[PDB]
Structure formats: structure tokens, C-alpha cells
Subunit: 31 residues, 3 copies
């Protein structure tokens, strides 16, 4: 379970980091 | 405690997957 | 270690919520 939890939260931060980059670009392109 | 963490972890991951979907749609819509 | 995982999960959720608000604003202004 601990591995399971560490892996899922890592995955979460990695995808969150990536979406922040995408949102930052859309924001610039937009208004 | 560990169980309530898993709960938050799985919830965060689900919302991240949804956001990915929202962002793919926005990137296409905005171009 | 449990506390580091809890910090990470909370940061993960904070970012997620924040991205939901950013996406929500983009969608309202996009159209
Ligand atoms: Zn992407
Ligand atoms: Zn949505
Ligand atoms: Zn922001």
C-alpha cells in the first residue's frame, strides 16, 4: 500500500505539473 | 489514516484525468 | 513518511482545485 500510495501521488503531481503548463499556454493564447 | 490518504490520492487522480479531458478539448477549441 | 505523503497529497489537491478554477474561467471566456 505505501508503494501504491507513493506511486499514485507521484503520477498525480507529474500530470498536474503538465496540465499547469498547458493551462498557462491556453491562458496566454486567450485573454 | 492510510485509508483516508488513499481516498484523497484516488480522488485527486480522478479529477486530474477529467482535467486532462477538459484541457484536450480546450486546446482543440482554441487551437 | 506518512506526513510527507499527506503534504504531497494536499499539494496535489490544491493544484487540482486551482486548475479546475482556471479551466472553468477559460471555458466561460472561450464560449
Ligand atoms: Zn498535454
Ligand atoms: Zn469538467
Ligand atoms: Zn493559475
Amino acid at each position: 500500500r505505501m508503494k501504491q500510495l507513493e506511486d499514485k501521488v507521484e503520477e498525480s503531481l507529474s500530470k498536474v505539473y503538465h496540465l499547469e503548463n498547458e493551462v498557462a499556454r491556453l491562458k496566454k493564447l486567450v485573454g
